Amino acid sequence: FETDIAIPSGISRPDAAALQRCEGRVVFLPTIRRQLTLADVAHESFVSGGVSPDTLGLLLAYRRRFPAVITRVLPTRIVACPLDVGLTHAGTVNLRNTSPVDLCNGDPISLVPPVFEDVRLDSLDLTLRFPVPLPSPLAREIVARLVARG
Amino acid sequence: FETDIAIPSGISRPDAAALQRCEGRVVFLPTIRRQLTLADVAHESFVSPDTLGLLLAYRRRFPAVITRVLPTRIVACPLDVGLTHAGTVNLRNTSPVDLCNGDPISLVPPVFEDVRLDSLDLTLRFPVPLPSPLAREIVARLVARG
Amino acid sequence: RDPPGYRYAAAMVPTGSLLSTIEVASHRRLFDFFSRVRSDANSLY
Amino acid sequence: EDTEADVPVTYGEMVLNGANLVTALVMGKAVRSLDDVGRHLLEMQEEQL
Amino acid sequence: EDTEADVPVTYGEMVLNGANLVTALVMGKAVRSLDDVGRHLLEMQEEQL
Numbered sequence: 001f002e003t004d005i006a007i008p009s010g011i012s013r014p015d016a017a018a019l020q021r022c023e024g025r026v027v028f029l030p031t032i033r034r035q036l037t038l039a040d041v042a043h044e045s046f047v048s049g050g051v052s053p054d055t056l057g058l059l060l061a062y063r064r065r066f067p068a069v070i071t072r073v074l075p076t077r078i079v080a081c082p083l084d085v086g087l088t089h090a091g092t093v094n095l096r097n098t099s100p101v102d103l104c105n106g107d108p109i110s111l112v113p114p115v116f117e118d119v120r121l122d123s124l125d126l127t128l129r130f131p132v133p134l135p136s137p138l139a140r141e142i143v144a145r146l147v148a149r150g
Numbered sequence: 151f152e153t154d155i156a157i158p159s160g161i162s163r164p165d166a167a168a169l170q171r172c173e174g175r176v177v178f179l180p181t182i183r184r185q186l187t188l189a190d191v192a193h194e195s196f197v198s199p200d201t202l203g204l205l206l207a208y209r210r211r212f213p214a215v216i217t218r219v220l221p222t223r224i225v226a227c228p229l230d231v232g233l234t235h236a237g238t239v240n241l242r243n244t245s246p247v248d249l250c251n252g253d254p255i256s257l258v259p260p261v262f263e264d265v266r267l268d269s270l271d272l273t274l275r276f277p278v279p280l281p282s283p284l285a286r287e288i289v290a291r292l293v294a295r296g
Numbered sequence: 297r298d299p300p301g302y303r304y305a306a307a308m309v310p311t312g313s314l315l316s317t318i319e320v321a322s323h324r325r326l327f328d329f330f331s332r333v334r335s336d337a338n339s340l341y
Numbered sequence: 342e343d344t345e346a347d348v349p350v351t352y353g354e355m356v357l358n359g360a361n362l363v364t365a366l367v368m369g370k371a372v373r374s375l376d377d378v379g380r381h382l383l384e385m386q387e388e389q390l
Numbered sequence: 391e392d393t394e395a396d397v398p399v400t401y402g403e404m405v406l407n408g409a410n411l412v413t414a415l416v417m418g419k420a421v422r423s424l425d426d427v428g429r430h431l432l433e434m435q436e437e438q439l
Contacts, residue, residue: 013163023338072338162298269297305366306421309430360409363428368417379412 001086002071005029005036005078012123019073022119024096026111026131028065032082041078042126058113062131067111069093099134107135115146151232153179153214155186155224162269166221172265173219174242176257176277178211182228192272204259208277213257215239245280256282261292299329304340 007019029041039045046053046061053061068082071093081093097103100116111131119128134142155177157169180190189195196207214226217239227239243249246262257277265274280288320330331337355373357365365371372378406414410424421427 303367303369305363305431306427308434309427311422360428363424363431364413364417366431367421367424367427368413368419370417372416375412375416378416379409382412382415 001089002079002081003029003032003034003036003068003086005038005041005080007038007076007078008124010123011075015121015123016075018119018121019078022070022096022128022130023073024094025070025098026095026133027068027070027080028062028131029068029080029082030065032066032085038078038124039126041128043129044126055113055115058129062111062113067131069095095133097133098130099132101134101138103135107137109133110136110139112139112143151227151235152217153182153186153226153228154184155179155188155191155226157188157222157224158270160269161221165267165269168265168267169219169224172242172274172276173216174240175216175244176241176279177214177216177224177226178208178277179214179226179228180211182212182231188224188270189272191274193275194272201259201261204275208257213277215241241279244276244278247280247284249281253281253283255279256285258285258289261288301339302329 027041029036030045043052046057049057066082066084068080068086070078070080072079081087081090087093103109111133114129114132116132118130120126121128177191179186180195196203199207212228212230214228217225217227219225227233233239244260249255257279260275260278262278265276267274320327321332324330331339333340357371359376360379361371361375364375404422406420408425409428410420413424414420
């Protein structure tokens with residue numbers, strides 16, 4: 001079960017290579033749907049409010065959105081499968097780390113907004129913030145560190 | 151009578167578009183020849199000299215003006231033999247000066263403010279065709295600055 | 297940089313055959329485009 | 342002024358049967374009708390204007 | 391072992407007389423022998439392995 005995120009027209013030449021570099025990465029969408037536009041996918045899609053959302057409001061949307069892991073990237077559409085319905089039929093989907101921290105076998109993996117330190121598409125005027133797939137026992141440490149910092 | 155400055159293969163994508171935008175601009179060269187390696191054109195080929203060393207090296211070299219730009223060769227023509235038998239080859243300003251009809255035009259190294267290639271590993275500095283009555287002024291202004 | 301991709305259907309009819317196996321991963325700079333394949337690639341099909 | 346009009350029936354077929362298929366695969370782009378555009382780039386070479 | 395060898399005479403011809411010239415002017419690329427690649431992508435495709 002693989003959805004489609006269509007790229008709108010007018011892609012520059014470095015930007016077809018920029019989206020060639022997010023091959024296996026976690027992306028949030030509103031509703032599982034066989035066709036979807038990229039403007040509903042980007043970081044702009046939930047800047048609702050008058051301030052772009054900080055790390056708190058990032059967390060709230062991540063439980064109201066349904067996480068998908070990108071498969072192959074065709075130059076016309078981004079093919080993805082979500083992590084709630086598409087994975088009972090197809091067994092196992094590859095995933096790329098953006099973490100500074102390596103993964104072991106058998107860990108469970110949560111996601112954190114990019115608090116540590118971001119593909120921009122100037123042919124389309126949007127940013128693509130991506131979550132940080134770190135292992136879940138660190139998640140109750142690292143967020144508890146950064147709250148303890150302030 | 152046209153020179154053929156050849157481009158060494160291994161060009162990236164915006165670099166062939168980077169030389170696509172300097173259509174009518176002045177380029178120096180060592181010696182008039184039918185074919186010519188591109189490394190003689192580059193700013194590396196003046197060793198890096200300051201503003202003075204270009205003024206010495208411009209007069210020892212021969213000013214040439216780019217015609218069409220093919221991706222395989224940059225076809226130019228010199229300003230001393232190829233123009234005094236045929237008519238006229240165009241020219242683009244890089245100047246902050248808008249030109250008038252009927253002036254004598256010299257060139258100055260760009261003290262005002264540059265097309266840098268990177269996959270070929272060379273810069274290309276270019277002269278500024280401002281009018282020669284300003285050229286005895288502006289150079290004398292800038293010496294009066296220091 | 298550009299690793300520009302080639303055309304895969306001229307690949308289907310080979311024009312000639314090599315005579316000896318040659319280690320590719322020994323170096324990079326003699327070559328122009330290369331990709332290691334885990335027996336099947338996205339970009340192939 | 343009128344009640345009954347004439348309208349054509351069949352849609353248009355733009356299919357890659359023939360040598361356009363080889364250009365789509367090997368050459369990596371495709372002309373709309375190469376079986377005519379490739380033909381009319383021969384008689385212009387010779388005849389007239 | 392020997393002083394007199396046998397050497398070929400002609401060079402190699404690759405002239406764009408054919409359907410490659412069409413792709414030269416409109417497609418902007420060129421197969422080496424499209425007269426056979428374009429042929430052999432029809433018997434391979436449907437008949438055998």
